[PDB]
Structure 1
């Protein structure tokens, strides 16, 4: 049973934070410097935001664990700004670290973190511009300019406008969440990158070709969809087995009797109403015979997640038995069309009766073009979705943070003693996030930060650093438009996360 206490003990806890704050340092755009993180399970791992990998880490300090937990809190609510919270909390504590040595050990610190956080939130909300969806704009054209903000950063040329107006159409129709989960974007090999397709409903990326795959029908006008999490093949129901021998007909009989059981499975669901069979587990060679001959469509080897989207939108439901089951475990569409696009066979289910999935289908025909489009469209769908929920929009780029840092510099003058010092650390900490944007755009980060403060003392505007252009200028007039609300959440979560760590400086551990 271990016990540790002291002023150097406090210093320990902050030092741990820096280590996790470095893992996530920059991921705002697509520059920084990564190292592939491959696990001991023999899996290679990367993500598109650096907070994901950070969640997986197990920290051996409890004080460091608090900062892990607030990451999980941000990620679930907004789904953005998760990185931002780590940076502010850690950095605040960094400029406080040598202040503790001097005398800022006392619990008074917690009080100061509250005054700074409460003012700052209010200043955002007031400065932010409240704009309808019918002010002087279509609902789709407000969210067009907000969806562009993600798209311009990387790395997709002039198709970015076109894709933007498209990606919106899916989000409005579904809206009732702040997550991209019920949308998604599916890459397709081959085809035109000069247009892409917005499909209402679900689709499948690839179904493998089987014996009489083109002898199965590809079009239906009242497809009734059987969702099967099972399989039939030679290893799911046998078609080889030992028999007694004393006549030739014994041999015939055994193969005959086995083919019947596999034929029962498609028939029973077909007679309920099925003609479309969708399965994520493999379908074999023996399996596909019965289907090809019946002139009833089959599909095997389609992604597990994609099959689960099919359930919601068509009103189908999971099965575990395909024998003797209702027709109310089936979903419908009005259109089934199979068109082979590039090297992969593409199943499109659309005409969906309740349409609780709609999804953008992005056709490029590469690996290079498509991963950067997908990376940008993931964050596009986050900006537009959250613009319906909070209708206050403020400049990003860290432009507003530079204004808070101004505002708080003023405040530090009438606020007294040990608290003032705490406020000066808050102000310095706000500038870290834009410094990394300067490292990504390619500038001298300290030179830049100072020029934005000048136009926050000569107008109070929106001057900040762009990675969405890779320059310095107003971000409101550059259509770098993201909600007020991402910023509201990130401040309050960063203070909350902070106060806990500086307070603990007496840690009792048990390795029991």
Structure 2
């Protein structure tokens, strides 16, 4: 029975709620970051190492927490995955300004000093950012291939990893249209060696009991296109039963007259009637997935039929060739051979049943890492190197400012240090010694030494090809500073219930 909603008490309550939100998702930062199974309460436990997904599934009622989560989501939808980084940085700002608002520092002074320090950092980062785009990136792609290496370093899959990186990089050159998350997908295949994974200019979807009609399709067909039908095709007595037979007969006649190689019906197509429905003389299917559709209208333009005897020019339109082969002993259904097949799928060929999560964490990062490397030009050493450099700049400039902004900028610099701290925490190493060595080397020795996840020691991450877009870091830091400013700018909470 404790009530605390006064200005300073409400500010400390809000920033403590932000601290709790950060504490919830502290340990998921980094490639070797651990996770938690969270059950939605309906019996469906959820595992996802990405922090953004964790916040998406997470639900918190505090208004300050809600604002912080909203800012994190806004950052997520813009560029890369910096949600964990920005949330941790803002929470560090708040927890290090705790001992400043706790005794009388007015919020506006803090807001002004935070804006000044943010401008100082965003200006001092541009003197250190190095552009590599002209260093043999579009052609003679050894550097970009090494960037692909960095996303999957220190693993026995290295023999397969080199081929997979060349795979994804060639997919990038032949899809260098600012690739996104949904433009490229993956499909799971059971059995086979890891090396057997190979790229197909299309999609893969195994046919099930309610997917396809019959086997031995005309694979080598010159112009097979997807045809979607919104009419049932599967199988008082003389009033509805004869009507059903007439409907079946006219639908079969429509299918025969259309001549579409691939036919999709809205009702499921049962395999028990495979011998009954093998007389269609061309491939028929049903219950098409929405993802498969979305990967086919942009591929070569599958059509949709919406009448009893609907016929369109794209039921048998111009697509290159159809693929349907035995994959692991079971024949799949590939909607390949499309002039605008802007969807390359990595066939997950491996002998591990539970390898899907490792594939998602190991194949989705390579395309993203190379895409972010290509999109931006100026890059800085990662692994906390840029954070340590910014911390050193802000700490050495704070002592140069006469006024109340000095302590605020000092706390800001002290709060920019969590990224190496969190990375070495998730690596499992003791944070004190590694952070100590990194800070000493960065301040005295070099301006780009960063954390190493492989040997667990301080190293010049610039040489380790640990890259990151300068603009992405700039906007992430700006968003974190804006979030901190907004959450500090709170004085009173008003609810005024209608009831």
Q: 2: distance between equivalents of 1:133 and 1:347?
A: 42
Q: Tell me: CA distance 1:197–1:215, structure 2 relative to 1, closer, same or farther (3 Å).
A: closer
Unaligned runs of at least 5 residues, structure 1: 235-249
Counterpart residue number, 1:3: 4
Q: Tell me: CA distance 1:379–1:254, structure 2 relative to 1, closer, same or farther (3 Å).
A: same
Q: 1: distance between equivalents of 2:294 and 2:255?
A: 19
Contact 1:154 1:376 in 2 (8 A): no
Q: Tell me: CA distance 1:483–1:269, structure 2 relative to 1, closer, same or farther (3 Å).
A: farther
Shift of 1:330: 6.2
Contact 1:216 1:291 in 2 (8 A): no
Shift of 1:478: 1.4
Q: 2: distance between equivalents of 1:154 and 1:509?
A: 53
Shift of 1:343: 5.0
157-166 or 211-220, which moves further after superposition? 211-220
Secondary structure, aligned partner of 1:373? helix
Shift of 1:288: 4.6
Q: 2: distance between equivalents of 1:402 and 1:229?
A: 60
96-105 or 310-319, which moves further after superposition? 310-319
Counterpart residue number, 2:192: 191
Contact 2:226 2:316 in 1 (8 A): yes
71-80 or 53-62, which moves further after superposition? 53-62
Q: Tell me: CA distance 1:291–1:422, structure 2 relative to 1, closer, same or farther (3 Å).
A: farther
**Superposed counterparts of 1:120-269, under 5 Å:** 120-132=121-133, 135=136, 138=139, 140-152=141-153, 156-177=157-178, 179-208=180-209, 213-228=214-229, 232-234=233-235, 257-265=243-251, 267-268=253-254
Contact 1:89 1:498 in 2 (8 A): yes
Q: 1: distance between equivalents of 2:266 and 2:247?
A: 21
490-499 or 292-301, which moves further after superposition? 292-301
347-356 or 132-141, which moves further after superposition? 132-141
Unaligned runs of at least 5 residues, structure 2: none
**Superposed counterparts of 1:23-62, under 5 Å:** 23-29=24-30, 31=32, 34-62=35-63
Q: 2: distance between equivalents of 1:213 and 1:178?
A: 36
277-286 or 472-481, which moves further after superposition? 277-286
Q: CA RMSD in A?
A: 3.1
Q: Tell me: CA distance 1:170–1:259, structure 2 relative to 1, closer, same or farther (3 Å).
A: farther
Secondary structure, aligned partner of 1:289? coil
Contact 1:133 1:142 in 2 (8 A): no
Q: Deviations over 1:168-217 (max 9, x none)?
A: 23333334446211101222112231131111223324444889733544
Q: Tell me: CA distance 1:228–1:202, structure 2 relative to 1, closer, same or farther (3 Å).
A: farther
Shift of 1:397: 0.8
Contact 1:191 1:342 in 2 (8 A): yes
Contact 2:34 2:426 in 1 (8 A): no
Q: 2: distance between equivalents of 1:301 and 1:188?
A: 21
Secondary structure, aligned partner of 2:152? helix
TM-score by length of 2: 0.89
Secondary structure, aligned partner of 2:263? strand
Q: Tell me: CA distance 1:433–1:106, structure 2 relative to 1, closer, same or farther (3 Å).
A: same
Shift of 1:479: 2.1
214-223 or 444-453, which moves further after superposition? 214-223
Shift of 1:124: 3.0
Q: 2: distance between equivalents of 1:459 and 1:415?
A: 26
Q: Tell me: CA distance 1:196–1:37, structure 2 relative to 1, closer, same or farther (3 Å).
A: same
Shift of 1:36: 1.6
Q: 2: distance between equivalents of 1:104 and 1:131?
A: 44
Q: 1: distance between equivalents of 2:49 and 2:231?
A: 33
Contact 2:39 2:45 in 1 (8 A): yes
Contact 2:211 2:287 in 1 (8 A): no
Q: Deviations over 1:11-52 (max 9, x none)?
A: 000011112112221223455554321113443322230222
Counterpart residue number, 2:469: 483
Counterpart residue number, 2:85: 84
> Which of 370, 395, 402 in structure 2 is aligned with 1:416?
402
Contact 2:225 2:315 in 1 (8 A): no
Contact 2:189 2:348 in 1 (8 A): yes
Q: Deviations over 1:386-445 (max 9, x none)?
A: 223212222211111111111111111112332111112211222112112112223111
Q: 2: distance between equivalents of 1:79 and 1:319?
A: 39
Shift of 1:272: 4.1
Q: Tell me: CA distance 1:403–1:261, structure 2 relative to 1, closer, same or farther (3 Å).
A: same
> Which of 439, 444, 454 in structure 1 is aligned with 2:425?
439
Q: Tell me: CA distance 1:113–1:141, structure 2 relative to 1, closer, same or farther (3 Å).
A: same
Q: Tell me: CA distance 1:36–1:347, structure 2 relative to 1, closer, same or farther (3 Å).
A: same
148-157 or 84-93, which moves further after superposition? 148-157
462-471 or 151-160, which moves further after superposition? 151-160
Shift of 1:72: 1.5
Secondary structure, aligned partner of 2:182? coil
Shift of 1:489: 2.1
Q: Deviations over 1:267-300 (max 9, x none)?
A: 5366445111246863124765564212211334
Shift of 1:229: 6.1
Q: 1: distance between equivalents of 2:73 and 2:231?
A: 34
TM-score by length of 1: 0.87
Shift of 1:134: 6.8
99-108 or 152-161, which moves further after superposition? 152-161
Contact 2:212 2:286 in 1 (8 A): no
Q: Tell me: CA distance 1:153–1:311, structure 2 relative to 1, closer, same or farther (3 Å).
A: farther
328-337 or 291-300, which moves further after superposition? 328-337
Q: Tell me: CA distance 1:262–1:509, structure 2 relative to 1, closer, same or farther (3 Å).
A: same
